Design an enzyme around this catalytic site. Sequence first.
Site, PDB file in Angstrom:
ATOM      1  N   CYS A   1       3.007  -3.061  10.107  1.00  0.00           N
ATOM      2  CA  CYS A   1       1.816  -2.087  10.613  1.00  0.00           C
ATOM      3  C   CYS A   1       0.541  -2.734  11.034  1.00  0.00           C
ATOM      4  CB  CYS A   1       1.421  -0.882   9.790  1.00  0.00           C
ATOM      5  SG  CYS A   1       2.874   0.286   9.601  1.00  0.00           S
TER       6      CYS A   1
ATOM      7  N   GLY B   1       5.542  -3.946   6.149  1.00  0.00           N
ATOM      8  CA  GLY B   1       4.100  -5.009   6.403  1.00  0.00           C
ATOM      9  C   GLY B   1       4.199  -5.223   7.982  1.00  0.00           C
TER      10      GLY B   1
ATOM     11  N   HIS C   1      -4.681   3.547   7.315  1.00  0.00           N
ATOM     12  CA  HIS C   1      -3.786   4.077   6.164  1.00  0.00           C
ATOM     13  C   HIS C   1      -3.744   2.740   5.191  1.00  0.00           C
ATOM     14  CE1 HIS C   1      -0.144   1.656   7.227  1.00  0.00           C
ATOM     15  NE2 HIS C   1      -0.081   2.253   8.456  1.00  0.00           N
TER      16      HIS C   1
HETATM   17  C1  LIG Z   1       3.731   0.126   8.429  1.00  0.00           C
HETATM   18  N1  LIG Z   1       3.871  -1.008   7.612  1.00  0.00           N
HETATM   19  C2  LIG Z   1       4.518   1.152   7.727  1.00  0.00           C
HETATM   20  C3  LIG Z   1       5.744   1.440   8.632  1.00  0.00           C
HETATM   21  C4  LIG Z   1       6.907   0.416   8.796  1.00  0.00           C
HETATM   22  C5  LIG Z   1       7.790   0.241   7.431  1.00  0.00           C
HETATM   23  C6  LIG Z   1       8.911   0.960   7.644  1.00  0.00           C
HETATM   24  C7  LIG Z   1      10.094  -0.258   7.204  1.00  0.00           C
HETATM   25  C8  LIG Z   1       9.072   2.261   6.916  1.00  0.00           C
HETATM   26  N2  LIG Z   1       9.329   0.979   9.117  1.00  0.00           N
HETATM   27  C9  LIG Z   1       7.840   0.627   9.567  1.00  0.00           C
HETATM   28  O1  LIG Z   1       7.725   0.763  10.887  1.00  0.00           O
HETATM   29  N3  LIG Z   1       3.789   2.402   8.000  1.00  0.00           N
HETATM   30  C10 LIG Z   1       4.200   3.342   7.161  1.00  0.00           C
HETATM   31  O2  LIG Z   1       4.937   3.177   6.285  1.00  0.00           O
HETATM   32  C11 LIG Z   1       3.130   4.744   7.455  1.00  0.00           C
HETATM   33  C12 LIG Z   1       1.962   4.946   6.726  1.00  0.00           C
HETATM   34  C13 LIG Z   1       2.122   4.831   5.271  1.00  0.00           C
HETATM   35  C14 LIG Z   1       3.038   5.854   4.593  1.00  0.00           C
HETATM   36  C15 LIG Z   1       3.444   6.747   5.901  1.00  0.00           C
HETATM   37  C16 LIG Z   1       2.267   7.405   6.605  1.00  0.00           C
HETATM   38  C17 LIG Z   1       1.494   6.384   7.220  1.00  0.00           C
HETATM   39  F1  LIG Z   1       1.445   6.731   8.461  1.00  0.00           F
HETATM   40  F2  LIG Z   1       0.147   6.507   6.717  1.00  0.00           F
HETATM   41  N4  LIG Z   1       4.075   5.946   6.773  1.00  0.00           N
HETATM   42  C18 LIG Z   1       5.420   6.169   7.328  1.00  0.00           C
HETATM   43  O3  LIG Z   1       5.834   5.322   8.210  1.00  0.00           O
HETATM   44  C19 LIG Z   1       6.194   7.167   6.973  1.00  0.00           C
HETATM   45  C20 LIG Z   1       6.016   8.095   7.853  1.00  0.00           C
HETATM   46  C21 LIG Z   1       6.672   9.793   7.498  1.00  0.00           C
HETATM   47  C22 LIG Z   1       6.453  10.833   8.157  1.00  0.00           C
HETATM   48  C23 LIG Z   1       8.036  11.446   8.366  1.00  0.00           C
HETATM   49  C24 LIG Z   1       8.039   9.841   7.824  1.00  0.00           C
HETATM   50  N5  LIG Z   1       7.873   6.757   7.190  1.00  0.00           N
HETATM   51  C25 LIG Z   1       8.633   6.973   6.256  1.00  0.00           C
HETATM   52  O4  LIG Z   1       8.499   7.341   5.091  1.00  0.00           O
HETATM   53  C26 LIG Z   1      10.129   6.573   6.334  1.00  0.00           C
HETATM   54  F3  LIG Z   1      10.880   6.030   5.452  1.00  0.00           F
HETATM   55  F4  LIG Z   1      10.747   7.753   7.182  1.00  0.00           F
HETATM   56  F5  LIG Z   1      10.241   5.645   7.704  1.00  0.00           F
END
Ligand SMILES: *C(=N)[C@H](C[C@H]1CC(C)(C)NC1=O)NC(=O)[C@@H]1[C@@H]2CC[C@@H](CC2(F)F)N1C(=O)[C@@H](CC1CCC1)NC(=O)C(F)(F)F
EC number: 3.4.19.12
Lengths: 303, 302
Positions: free
Chosen positions: A142, A140, A41
Amino acid sequence: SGFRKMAFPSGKVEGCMVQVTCGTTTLNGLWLDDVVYCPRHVICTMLNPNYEDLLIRKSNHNFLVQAGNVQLRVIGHSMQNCVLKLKVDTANPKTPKYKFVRIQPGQTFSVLACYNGSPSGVYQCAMRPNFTIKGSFLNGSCGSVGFNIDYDCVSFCYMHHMELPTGVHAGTDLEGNFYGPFVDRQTAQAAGTDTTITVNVLAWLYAAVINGDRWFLNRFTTTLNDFNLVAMKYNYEPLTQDHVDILGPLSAQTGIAVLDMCASLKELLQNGMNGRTILGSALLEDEFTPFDVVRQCSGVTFQ
Amino acid sequence: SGFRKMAFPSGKVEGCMVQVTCGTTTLNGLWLDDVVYCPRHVICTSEDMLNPNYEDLLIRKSNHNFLVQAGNVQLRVIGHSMQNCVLKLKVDTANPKTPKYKFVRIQPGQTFSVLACYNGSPSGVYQCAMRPNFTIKGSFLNGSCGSVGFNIDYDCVSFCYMHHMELPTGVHAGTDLEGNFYGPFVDRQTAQAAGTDTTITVNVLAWLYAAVINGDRWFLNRFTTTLNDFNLVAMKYNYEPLTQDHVDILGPLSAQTGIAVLDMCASLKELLQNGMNGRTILGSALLEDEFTPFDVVRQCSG
Ligand SMILES: *C(=N)[C@H](C[C@H]1CC(C)(C)NC1=O)NC(=O)[C@@H]1[C@@H]2CC[C@@H](CC2(F)F)N1C(=O)[C@@H](CC1CCC1)NC(=O)C(F)(F)F
Ligand SMILES: *C(=N)[C@H](C[C@H]1CC(C)(C)NC1=O)NC(=O)[C@@H]1[C@@H]2CC[C@@H](CC2(F)F)N1C(=O)[C@@H](CC1CCC1)NC(=O)C(F)(F)F
Ligand SMILES: [Cl-]
């Protein structure tokens, strides 16, 4: 004596962590031999991404990889499931002895939480029955990894990809296969109803008895079928003969049969704690495996 | 989001741990530049553990009596010195893995990471608080002494604890890296007991702020309190006094959540009166006191 939630020493993994920047997204990568592993991602700029098509449009120079204040040259990129593999010009001189493993629900590991390729903290997690972890992750985070250590060998079992709306966490093995029914996309997703890891609760009750906490012990024993009827009713995972076998050592040591300890747990579930604690907890802890208890109570070391 | 008991990454400390043997006693030492720091009770024999004369025992020691091992390498002791309860062994080789470091003496309520070690090899890492009664609730077996407690600021390790002893209640005592014990304890087998422990009130408040930052508000109430009225109630539950310094230190978490410190004090007052009533806070059915305001800000805010 004493009993703490104990992580593995993180030093062998700290020397593998790098920063990966693509477009506006910075996250962490794992630098092993001449490959950096990170979440795919990172390439995204998200509702329904075509990862294979998005990757074809990328060049090697789009990926900024930094090990401290040293930029690594990317000479190749490929996708394995939900993980990006960036081939670099330099092999990591700090590469430990390692392998990639897939863990089962109820297994524990240590998370090294990282930001901008710099390790920030380490904590112990269990893979929940619903295939989430109860982590602690900010923006950040991930590409942070989960591991176990056996002798001198790091077993990488987890890379961090996402937070679900209930504030629990999901990710992949280092071959990029998701734990649980999740996708790396901004679309409606929920953690399933969670259950308690029964075998781990029993291991922790054994740990309590080893540390001289014994008020919950009783004269009674149960059968595996009668216990599993009660387990099912209280949202506890079924106890199998494999679990009974694995608890064999702690059964012998304390002189408390697994099904005798099951009779104690049955009473705790039916009657509660009655204002009492076990190892400084007012609830039943399920994030210690039988092996976690043995290695902490024996003082196993890692070189 | 999420909230975990989080240790510092242990790698910078792992590269400093060595084994120290005198006679039949093996424990851990901390190898920084050309000095190995370890507990002085390594020189003691089983005959003389009630009332050791450490000055008398050490003058009798030769450099070759001290077997120091860094992995599969014997270090040569060329000099020894005693500072309070810590033995400083000068060695011929400097530690090439020596990080940026400071020695700091911490106050009760302060947290740190313990790297539990046996035979100079790390077993595990966990968080501890210095309790008001100057003990820590560790996890330590035979040979654990010389294991250290530390915090990491940027690239710099602040060493604040060296492990020396277990008290009969199964809690732990030790020294700063200048060899001064936390609390009234001494490195002797003579009968010693920890004083009555108290709850670190400022830490419980920090944790309730962490709970609010993570989206839980069920325990909040419409009431406020005076600092003196809060302290009169907290004292009856064996909670440490809250000072104006503690109120000042909680200022940043108050600003972020929009909950005044004395409003959060009113919530804790109610929680102490009522208990949790089958609810949890941050996956706990008790009030957690081993997170500082500083721990909460770094984990919740970055
Ligand atoms: C990695 N850096 C982040 C996750 C960290 C950032 C934070 C504070 C939300 N908590 C973490 O553990 N990964 C993501 O943000 C991922 C990526 C990019 C956007 C989205 C899809 C992905 F997997 F490609 N994502 C999410 O974590 C979203 C997933 C949504 C599916 C229903 C929630 N999460 C969110 O938006 C939230 F706010 F609910 F956590
Ligand atoms: C360091 N290796 C050990 C302490 C570890 C070993 C164990 C299992 C007891 N728990 C530990 O944390 N340090 C000691 O054993 C110290 C040294 C040597 C003997 C004695 C005095 C000392 F500080 F110099 N000691 C103890 O820990 C004794 C202290 C007694 C005073 C009141 C108890 N502790 C005990 O004997 C016991 F059983 F209470 F833990
Ligand atoms: Cl302090």
